């Protein structure tokens, strides 16, 4: 079938499935990670229908099903679903077989250690991948970033990290995860659209209003005097034509959307935000590590792509690290794939070649091997 | 074992440079040298002047960012 | 490599290696002694990222590494680290090779005599040097100071000496050896600096409180006046940039520091104090030597540069030493560097080329010749 | 509402408030250092819910609060919610008036000394006792223990001292003072429970990772072998019912949290450790003291409740020591408490009635004056 040792390059961080080959730029399948199920009867007799539609087919029958994401907030609930993910991810859309090729898996730090665990059981023992790895999304961010030195935020559907890496070495002490991320986002975008007047409670219809959030909204670089502006006048009311039929105009649902991001007591979870975060993962480092933290800090995952986010984010790290200092709030176009073009990178070095979890070494000391060959 | 020396995928010379070229570190020519003294030199035929081993004398006329090969010739 | 017989002058009395060539004006490599160890892991592949750091690549960083001083109070404590010490001396820094080239070491008087033997040990076997010496430094000292007569104060990082000379003539029954350094020092000053609020705990951090204590120090002339002067205005608080942000102000911790050396009650180690250990190296000596010890008191080693101490102790010892008598403490500017420099002198002398402890005399005798030969 | 003139001994010193009256076996109010704050809007009209939750009252409603300790590492960080927190406690708890008490606080050797200044300026302004001193937390733990001679250990919730005394005389030049103590296990408790499975983000979810640390953790003897006991064999799994539902089961966390403070590379913080904090503390002291602080080494503050951390300790330092030394490590069962108990004796003695910082004489000159009669 393949010709080829190329290593796979799976990677579902929360809440999209992009995978490829190494050695690559692009990811060549990127699909919506969710399972379908049919939540009526079916009455064609003849038709195909079978009960499970994976990926983006499943949003081609949306309408139909009760979409269900298989994980969340970076933890994989149901090993069943992530199974057929994976079976439609490998068998396909990229369309090769597991047992020729080794796989680099990507998951979060401060992870529940089943999920890393009955992960690579189920790679080794129903898929029989020849070699597999756990590879830390932020880390493999900075891959992508070409640097070895910086503090990595990324922000995926369901966690965020800022990992502080200086010189090759990471700093595991100051590590942080803050369970705030775009999910959350298009929940309380589904709420204050529902205090607008536009009502979406079906989970196709969150899929709506996700789709409204990747569209339709900014970041609000002020939010006092953008909302003052919002309350002003009507430059900000924007119209979204919804699949079939009736359009919506939103006004400051359009910047309250990621600044519950930014400070997540509207959300009413118990945080410090964003920029708090970076900064306190900053201070819990060392001192001569710091500006080296500050010229290089990366936001190179999801949910950034909001316009200006940068200004923000660079306007509020000023304001809370000491002057004479150079905020430079790395922000490279080519994310939310920057985490798999960090597995390619890093599937495609000379030296990673020793570091592959293997069969006949997995079966040597049982599951517990990646606790002890990994991180 | 000089072919082996040059073109392994793991400890050759190309596969080294194909991974300096490959990831972004802020590399040059200097850093190069050392990764070839920390994985090329536990091999006999490889010749360098940072490392020891291959080889522990401080030969002359064997400059510094530079390394010998001892070929067929 | 090298088509000269220059002989090497390699000179870490306790903190601060600095080495180069006889017959030479300023020392060719001067870099502290540390040695850096990764204390956590690391995480990106293909680094290079050696567990070795030795010398002012270390403090490039001190950040991630546990520094480590190998030789404490002018004491070798571990041997490997030292050699590192020396490799990279040798062969980095000064890019030499060691076989060619005879060597001119330095240590402290009333030195633990392993140091001088497993030190020519060390010379001998390792790095295969053809000659070696084991310089005194205060001596060495007296020879950048141009004079044969008078009496050597240094006071190093780990060691002071007060060696009086009288017409070539050491006098070695009036020898003084006190622990009070500029470690212990740094060690008083950041204990005072934890007493204003600035807390230093890291061994990065203590070579920071070194670094306020290199730029912002003063020796207060009068301390009694001074320190109700730093009591009564802020005319001596004076701000500090640190590396990475917060700046500091320090007051009277800005002389507060030299007084622990001028009284080593405050760091609570039983002395007398320099001022009162000079005044006891010329009362242990002869009668008619005192007004040639009086005229020609050098003062040229490291821990001097705080401004104004030839005033302190000229204006101390005219206190203690009996009237009609002309206090000359000798403060060369080019102090700090004085013992490499009288390492040069006497590696360039003619006399001296019969005093070395050369190979196939080593192995003659064992490493005991040294005790014979040297001193 | 007080017919005597009974000192009062308050005692915070970093994380649990104790006070009560001299001469006095038991503390009176015991209560936690918080104060709470709502988060979010209230409802309910007709409640009272005043903005300000202090001591266990906070703990009744630590559900909707921002639980903030003011005190950090000994440092009082915000000195309104400090007093909010001696206003509840003269005023709620203990019940009596402070102007006709005197008071003798506790703080932290090597303390930023802004902290002991303002500290005396908020009792004499703004509660107006008529006296007041600055109590040393360690030298009162070594009252408690009816000693005059030993090292003292005690780890608070921000703080261990180490602090030598012999025969009534303390040694200031051999203090120590790490930042390592029990607020830093627990989040190094959450941060593994969150490796477990076990997901505490929240301040009252920090509280319940605070008290599953005081229920249900050892000090693991020999670290290695019950590291592969623990990874051997589920007799060490323990459950623990959580608030409010679902049951916890801990393994090798339960003896993790403390090795910590016995290892603090776990933690990333740079240091030696509890047992080489000690020994080298005694090091630092001169040789003919040392017996009796071998004899008389005290382990008597906070954070030592671990079962068999005597155990540890003596056998860690007999393994650090030189051999015939009697290394009694002295852990009185009345811990947690000794701090406060020689806050009750020192405050009862004859001999201390002069000691007494007063008004008119902190009136005389200013704030200054705890630096002069004090220490
Ligand atoms: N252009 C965009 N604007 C705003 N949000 C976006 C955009 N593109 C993706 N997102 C959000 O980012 C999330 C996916 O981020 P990603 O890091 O790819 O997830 P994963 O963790 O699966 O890798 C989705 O919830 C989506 O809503
Ligand atoms: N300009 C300066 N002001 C104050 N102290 C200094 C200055 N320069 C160096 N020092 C101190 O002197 C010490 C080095 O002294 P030196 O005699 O060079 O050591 P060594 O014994 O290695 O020769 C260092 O610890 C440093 O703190
Ligand atoms: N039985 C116990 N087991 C383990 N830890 C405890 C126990 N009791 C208290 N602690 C810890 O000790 C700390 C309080 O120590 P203490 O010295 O009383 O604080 P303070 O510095 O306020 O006096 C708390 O953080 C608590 O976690
Ligand atoms: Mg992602
Ligand atoms: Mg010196
Ligand atoms: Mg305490």
């Not at chain 1, 100051?174 to 204050?192: C, P, Q, S």
């Not at chain 1, 789709?211 to 670089?221: R, S």
């Not at chain 1, 060392?286 to 200004?311: C, E, F, Q, W």
């Given at each position: 079938?393949?010709?080829?040792?190329?290593?796979?390059?799976?990677?579902?961080?929360?809440?999209?499935?992009?995978?490829?080959?190494?050695?690559?730029?692009?990811?060549?399948?990127?699909?919506?990670?969710?399972?379908?199920?049919?939540?009526?009867?079916?009455?064609?007799?003849?038709?195909?229908?079978?009960?499970?539609?994976?990926?983006?087919?499943?949003?081609?029958?949306?309408?139909?099903?009760?979409?269900?994401?298989?994980?969340?907030?970076?933890?994989?609930?149901?090993?069943?679903?992530?199974?057929?993910?994976?079976?439609?991810?490998?068998?396909?859309?990229?369309?090769?077989?597991?047992?020729?090729?080794?796989?680099?898996?990507?998951?979060?730090?401060?992870?529940?250690?089943?999920?890393?665990?009955?992960?690579?059981?189920?790679?080794?023992?129903?898929?029989?991948?020849?070699?597999?790895?756990?590879?830390?999304?932020?880390?493999?961010?900075?891959?992508?970033?070409?640097?070895?030195?910086?503090?990595?935020?990324?922000?995926?559907?369901?966690?965020?990290?800022?990992?502080?890496?200086?010189?090759?070495?990471?700093?595991?002490?100051?590590?942080?995860?803050?369970?705030?991320?775009?999910?959350?986002?298009?929940?309380?975008?589904?709420?204050?659209?529902?205090?607008?007047?536009?009502?979406?409670?079906?989970?196709?219809?969150?899929?709506?209003?996700?789709?409204?959030?990747?569209?339709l909204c900014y970041v609000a670089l002020?939010?006092?005097?953008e909302?003052?502006?919002?309350?002003?006048?009507?430059?900000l009311?924007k119209?979204?034509?919804?699949?079939?039929?009736?359009?919506?105009?939103?006004?400051?649902?359009r910047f309250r959307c990621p600044e519950?991001?930014?400070?997540?007591?509207?959300?009413?979870?118990?945080?410090?935000?964003?920029?708090?975060?970076?900064?306190?993962?900053?201070?819990?480092?060392?001192?001569?590590?710091?500006?080296?933290?500050?010229?290089?800090?990366?936001?190179?995952?999801?949910?950034?792509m909001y316009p200006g986010i940068?200004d923000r984010?660079?306007?509020?790290?000023?304001?809370?690290?000491?002057?004479?200092?150079?905020?430079?709030?790395?922000?490279?176009?080519?994310?939310?794939?920057?985490?798999?073009?960090?597995?390619?990178?890093?599937?495609?070095?000379?030296?990673?070649?020793?570091?592959?979890?293997?069969?006949?070494?997995?079966?040597?000391?049982?599951?517990?091997?990646?606790?002890?060959?990994?991180? | 074992?000089?072919?082996?020396?040059?073109?392994?995928?793991?400890?050759?010379?190309?596969?080294?440079?194909?991974?300096?070229?490959?990831?972004?570190?802020?590399?040059?020519?200097?850093?190069?040298?050392?990764?070839?003294?920390?994985?090329?030199?536990?091999?006999?035929?490889?010749?360098?002047?940072?490392?020891?081993?291959?080889?522990?004398?401080?030969?002359?006329?064997?400059?510094?960012?530079?390394?010998?090969?001892?070929?067929?010739?």
């Amino acid at each position: 079938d393949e010709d080829e040792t190329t290593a796979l390059v799976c990677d579902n961080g929360s809440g999209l499935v992009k995978a490829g080959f190494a050695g690559d730029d692009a990811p060549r399948a990127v699909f919506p990670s969710i399972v379908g199920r049919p939540r009526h009867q079916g009455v064609m007799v003849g038709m195909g229908q079978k009960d499970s539609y994976v990926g983006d087919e499943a949003q081609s029958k949306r309408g139909i099903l009760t979409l269900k994401y298989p994980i969340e907030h970076g933890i994989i609930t149901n090993w069943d679903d992530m199974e057929k993910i994976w079976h439609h991810t490998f068998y396909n859309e990229l369309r090769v077989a597991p047992e020729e090729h080794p796989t680099l898996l990507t998951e979060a730090p401060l992870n529940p250690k089943a999920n890393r665990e009955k992960m690579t059981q189920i790679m080794f023992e129903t898929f029989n991948v020849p070699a597999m790895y756990v590879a830390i999304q932020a880390v493999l961010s900075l891959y992508a970033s070409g640097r070895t030195t910086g503090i990595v935020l990324d922000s995926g559907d369901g966690v965020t990290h800022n990992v502080p890496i200086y010189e090759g070495y990471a700093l595991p002490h100051a590590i942080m995860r803050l369970d705030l991320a775009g999910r959350d986002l298009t929940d309380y975008l589904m709420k204050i659209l529902t205090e607008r007047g536009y009502s979406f409670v079906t989970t196709a219809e969150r899929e709506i209003v996700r789709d409204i959030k990747e569209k339709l909204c900014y970041v609000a670089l002020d939010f006092e005097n953008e909302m003052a502006t919002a309350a002003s006048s009507s430059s900000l009311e924007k119209s979204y034509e919804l699949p079939d039929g009736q359009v919506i105009t939103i006004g400051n649902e359009r910047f309250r959307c990621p600044e519950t991001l930014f400070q997540p007591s509207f959300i009413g979870m118990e945080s410090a935000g964003i920029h708090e975060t970076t900064y306190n993962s900053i201070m819990k480092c060392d001192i001569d590590i710091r500006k080296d933290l500050y010229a290089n800090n990366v936001m190179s995952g999801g949910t950034t792509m909001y316009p200006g986010i940068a200004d923000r984010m660079q306007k509020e790290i000023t304001a809370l690290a000491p002057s004479t200092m150079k905020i430079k709030i790395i922000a490279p176009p080519e994310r939310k794939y920057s985490v798999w073009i960090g597995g390619s990178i890093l599937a495609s070095l000379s030296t990673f070649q020793q570091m592959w979890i293997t069969k006949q070494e997995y079966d040597e000391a049982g599951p517990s091997i990646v606790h002890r060959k990994c991180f | 074992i000089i072919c082996d020396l040059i073109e392994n995928n793991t400890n050759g010379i190309l596969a080294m440079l194909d991974e300096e070229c490959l990831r972004p570190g802020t590399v040059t020519d200097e850093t190069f040298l050392e990764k070839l003294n920390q994985v090329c030199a536990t091999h006999q035929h490889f010749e360098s002047r940072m490392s020891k081993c291959s080889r522990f004398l401080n030969d002359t006329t064997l400059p510094h960012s530079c390394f010998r090969i001892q070929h067929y010739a």
